[PDB]
Design an enzyme around this catalytic site. Structure first.
Site, PDB file in Angstrom:
ATOM      1  N   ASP A  35     -17.186  41.607  51.070  1.00 25.52           N
ATOM      2  CA  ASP A  35     -15.919  41.410  51.769  1.00 25.52           C
ATOM      3  C   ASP A  35     -15.286  42.762  52.104  1.00 25.52           C
ATOM      4  O   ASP A  35     -14.632  43.371  51.251  1.00 25.52           O
ATOM      5  CB  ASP A  35     -14.979  40.585  50.896  1.00 25.52           C
ATOM      6  CG  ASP A  35     -13.641  40.327  51.547  1.00 25.52           C
ATOM      7  OD1 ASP A  35     -13.553  40.576  52.769  1.00 25.52           O
ATOM      8  OD2 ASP A  35     -12.715  39.856  50.835  1.00 25.52           O
ATOM      9  N   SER A 199      -9.292  48.018  69.112  1.00 20.99           N
ATOM     10  CA  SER A 199     -10.143  47.659  70.234  1.00 20.99           C
ATOM     11  C   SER A 199      -9.464  48.032  71.547  1.00 20.99           C
ATOM     12  O   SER A 199      -8.237  48.001  71.666  1.00 20.99           O
ATOM     13  CB  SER A 199     -10.425  46.155  70.187  1.00 20.99           C
ATOM     14  OG  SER A 199     -11.151  45.717  71.329  1.00 20.99           O
TER      15      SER A 199
END
Length: 330
Positions: A35, A199
């Site tokens: 994770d 992004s």
């Protein structure tokens, strides 16, 4: 040193991935959920409340000659999906794919919430976010990667998750045969303890690319892709009959649909998520309403590049003095 381990989807939907991890002496092998969105290595154990164990493999520290109680240390964690676990702490030897750390904090669960009990395939979590998020008190503990870093050939790990197929976590090296083209690196903020990056925009299907900054986290421990409501609405508007359902808890779409791809930007580069990766199947057994793999982050407080996005790429988690993230197509 290096390590290399195969990671395997837990079910036919790629809801999560499990990677075998050796703990203790003699080794006890547990299948852990790696994770990158959390920083605790915790396991089902001989200390876990018996009614909360249902098929998981447990760590038994009393059977490990290298286990030592970390006196006074406790831990307690709550995840974004509302699940939680807590317990006490041992140090022990932990190996992943041939890479060994001695003295790793292994957090032994005394209590786990129902969703963990109900998932017999996941024996615990191995956190790979920054150690500042680790929950051990009163002495915070380091992640497996943090402990291994100095020994690694290069201070990196990579995630190569498969679509409906096994993939690989590598530590200490970049497998140049595992991706196409080049790796595009992008800046990371560690201020919130995550692999947080920006992004450069998105496209839906064959549509034109929209240049817009989307701050979010690379999180192997989250199944889906969570993005701003504007972006998610633009995606699902291209799917006939798709709608947001408050009763189901997100966007659903007709199971008869063919889904468009979704592209996200990494600098000037582009990662394409095929439409099929966005199908999470019937909302309930036999339903013709299917659950979408792109959902709004509006109720979270952060955008999450989860498995739906990461499995479309070869992802480098660069733990150099200034961390960065790398993405390549594959």
């Amino acid at each position: 040193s290096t390590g290399s381990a195969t990671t395997t989807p837990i079910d036919s939907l790629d809801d999560a991935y499990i990677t075998p991890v050796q703990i203790g002496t003699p080794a006890q092998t547990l299948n852990l959920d790696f994770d990158t969105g959390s920083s605790d290595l915790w396991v089902f154990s001989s200390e876990t409340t018996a009614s909360e164990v249902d098929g998981q493999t447990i760590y038994t520290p009393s059977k490990s000659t290298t286990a030592k109680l970390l006196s006074g240390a406790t831990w307690s964690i709550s995840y974004g999906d509302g699940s939680s676990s807590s317990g006490d702490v041992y140090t022990d030897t932990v190996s992943v794919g041939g890479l060994t750390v001695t003295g790793q904090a292994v957090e032994s669960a005394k209590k786990v919430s129902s969703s963990f009990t109900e998932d017999s395939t996941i024996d615990g979590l191995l956190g790979l976010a920054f150690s500042t998020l680790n929950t051990v008190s009163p002495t915070q503990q380091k992640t497996f990667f943090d402990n291994a870093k100095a020994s690694l050939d290069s201070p990196v790990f990579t995630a190569d998750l498969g679509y409906h197929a096994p993939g690989t976590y590598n530590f200490g090296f970049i497998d140049t045969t595992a991706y196409t083209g080049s790796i595009t690196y992008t800046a990371v903020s560690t201020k919130q303890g995550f692999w947080e990056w920006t992004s450069t925009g998105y496209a839906v299907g064959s549509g034109t690319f929209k240049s817009t900054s989307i701050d979010g986290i690379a999180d192997t421990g989250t199944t889906l892709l969570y993005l701003p409501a504007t972006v998610v609405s633009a995606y699902w508007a291209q799917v006939s009959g798709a709608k947001s359902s408050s009763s189901v808890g997100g966007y659903v779409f007709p199971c008869s649909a063919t889904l468009p791809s979704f592209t996200f930007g990494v600098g000037s580069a582009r990662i394409v998520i095929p439409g099929d990766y966005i199908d999470f199947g019937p909302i309930s057994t036999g339903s013709s309403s299917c659950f979408g793999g792109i959902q709004s982050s509006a109720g979270i407080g952060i955008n999450i590049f989860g498995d739906v996005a990461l499995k479309a790429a070869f992802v480098v988690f660069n733990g150099a003095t200034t961390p960065t993230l790398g993405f390549a197509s594959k």
